[PDB]
Design a protein around this ligand. Structure first.
Ligand SMILES: Cc1cc2nc3c(=O)[nH]c(=O)nc-3n(C[C@H](O)[C@H](O)[C@H](O)COP(=O)(O)OP(=O)(O)OC[C@H]3O[C@@H](n4cnc5c(N)ncnc54)[C@H](O)[C@@H]3O)c2cc1C
Ligand SMILES: O=C(O)CCn1c(=O)oc2cc(OCC3CCC3)c(Cl)cc21
Ligand SMILES: O=C(O)CCn1c(=O)oc2cc(OCC3CCC3)c(Cl)cc21
Ligand SMILES: [Cl-]
Length: 448
């Protein structure tokens, strides 16, 4: 049986462990954290993510989708909250088959852990990867106390997140051609209780947004009607705009409350523990990291966040990580050797990871922010009605299809260009020749 060592029992690592182990591979998975399935007396916060078709299909292939969806909250559309106006629901798709799912991160991780062990993988917790000796095929792990353990490896999979120790080790034997693009927004996680969400009539079957230009809040529902609220806000105020809001200006919980009362007045009354959450929850960091190289011969490979950290504005990081796990398991299972598998995996996934990284950055302005843009959307809907196999909105291609991200981006750009060009020099839909725009759709977009 072929052997593999996986670092990181997160989302991609556990899925790839199950897929390989059920194909008869001898799988050892090492995780720095303790086993979350071991119930303790600790009070762990109910953080969520959005599961879309790419992640759902990966779980479906693994035979875990039904179990994950049993605890997932349907999000039918985007609920935009702007003070003065009642909340407006913008459905994401054509019906309830085109929705996204709010899932508890910890619950998803537990189902994946159970799944990997059921398939025969061995999971070793409280062991963090410190270093790799590629020449000797040995690695060094340690617990929180720094007590070291050395292990031999045959194939190493780095599924160890955005601050990957496997990636750092690879960078000592190969030039990974890394480019780090820091993101100016930090994030803070806050909570809305089930009582508060019900009192203020907050729709449970929607993804909620409080746009505010340079900053915003997003809320995702939980099964118990609580919501996680995430504030995206600059770590520091820029030189050009010193007065502009930032985390640096919010010195304590009381400052955060005054900021919410002024900038998010319909949201602040729903945030009962705002002061405590602000002070006790650390401010998260966001970034985009692009690598030229994801592997070292047939010895080691990166996937998910270890390979391609991205900004979370499209809710596609986990979806991409699960899609990566399927691709990696498929290449490893069927290749002539590990070296061929790793090179083919990298060649297939790298253009798609770059496309989703770019689309995730672009989606911030879509959420956080026009007379011309409403005319564009109206025109885009007519085109989607007239040519349903040619004109598919970019959000739908990314979220509800398994079309390669690079193709979704390329088709999305043609669509965005067509709409922009068509509405330019026109104030309304009645002055636009619909058949001429449709001819450009049939000319530039092959049917899918
Ligand atoms: C604010 C925010 C919101 C997000 N929202 C969404 C969303 O709605 N939808 C979505 O699709 N994605 C979302 N994402 C992205 C998503 O969280 C990640 O892309 C996803 O978790 C990546 O999966 P992974 O397995 O590659 O990494 P991880 O899930 O981070 O797993 C890495 C694992 O490796 C372990 N580890 C780390 N270092 C070591 C080491 N040295 N040795 C051993 N183990 C180690 C970690 O403890 C962890 O268990 C969000 C991310 C952020 C920051
Ligand atoms: O354009 C839209 O209406 C939604 C885009 N999007 C998506 O489909 O899933 C998301 C998940 C997101 O983050 C959720 C986590 C922050 C802590 C929970 C964000 Cl920031 C954006 C998206
Ligand atoms: O009556 C009207 O409103 C204009 C119709 N019209 C036309 O006569 O030629 C067009 C060519 C167009 O696009 C060419 C390239 C931009 C990406 C393909 C468009 Cl989008 C619209 C037209
Ligand atoms: Cl994301």
């Amino acid at each position: 049986a072929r052997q593999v060592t996986i670092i990181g029992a997160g989302l991609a690592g556990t899925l790839v462990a199950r897929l390989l182990a059920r194909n008869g591979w001898q799988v050892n998975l090492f995780e720095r954290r303790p086993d979350p399935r071991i119930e303790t007396g600790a009070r762990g916060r109910s953080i969520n993510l959005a599961l879309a078709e790419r992640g759902a299909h990966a779980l479906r292939l693994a035979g875990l989708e039904r179990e994950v969806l049993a605890e997932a909250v349907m999000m039918r559309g985007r609920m935009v909250h702007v003070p003065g106006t009642p909340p407006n629901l913008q459905p994401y798709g054509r019906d309830d088959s085109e929705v996204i799912w709010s899932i508890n991160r910890d619950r998803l991780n537990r189902i994946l852990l159970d799944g990997a062990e059921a398939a025969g993988a061995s999971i070793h917790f409280n062991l963090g990867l410190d270093s790799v000796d590629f020449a000797r095929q040995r690695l060094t792990l340690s617990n929180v106390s720094g007590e070291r353990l050395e292990k031999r490896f045959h194939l190493l999979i780095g599924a160890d997140g955005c601050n990957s120790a496997v990636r750092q080790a690879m960078a000592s034997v190969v030039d990974l051609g890394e480019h780090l693009e820091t993101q100016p927004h930090g994030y803070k996680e806050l909570q809305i209780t089930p009582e508060a969400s019900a009192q203020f009539n907050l729709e449970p079957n929607a993804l909620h947004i409080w746009p505010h230009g340079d900053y915003m809040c997003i809320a995702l529902p939980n099964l118990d009607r609580s919501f996680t609220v995430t504030l995206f806000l600059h770590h520091q105020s820029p030189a050009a705009q010193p007065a502009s809001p930032s985390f640096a200006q919010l010195v304590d919980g009381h400052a955060a409350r005054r900021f919410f009362q002024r900038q998010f007045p319909d949201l602040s009354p729903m945030l009962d523990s705002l002061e405590q959450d602000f002070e006790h929850h650390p401010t998260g960091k966001l970034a985009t990291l692009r690598l030229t190289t994801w592997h070292v011969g047939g010895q080691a490979v990166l996937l998910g966040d270890a390979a391609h950290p991205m900004v979370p504005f499209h809710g596609q990081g986990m979806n991409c990580a699960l899609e990566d796990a399927v691709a990696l398991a498929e290449h490893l299972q069927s290749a002539a050797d590990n070296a061929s598998a790793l090179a083919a995996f990298t060649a297939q996934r790298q253009p798609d990871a770059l496309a989703i990284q770019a689309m995730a950055l672009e989606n911030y302005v879509e959420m956080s922010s026009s007379p011309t843009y409403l005319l564009e959307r109206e025109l885009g809907q007519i085109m989607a009605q007239r040519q349903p196999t040619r004109f598919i909105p970019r959000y739908s291609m990314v979220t509800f299809s398994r079309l390669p991200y690079a193709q979704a981006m390329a088709r999305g750009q043609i669509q965005e260009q067509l709409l922009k060009f068509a509405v330019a020099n026109h104030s309304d839909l009645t002055s636009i020749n619909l058949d001429a725009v449709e001819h450009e759709v049939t000319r530039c977009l092959p049917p899918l």
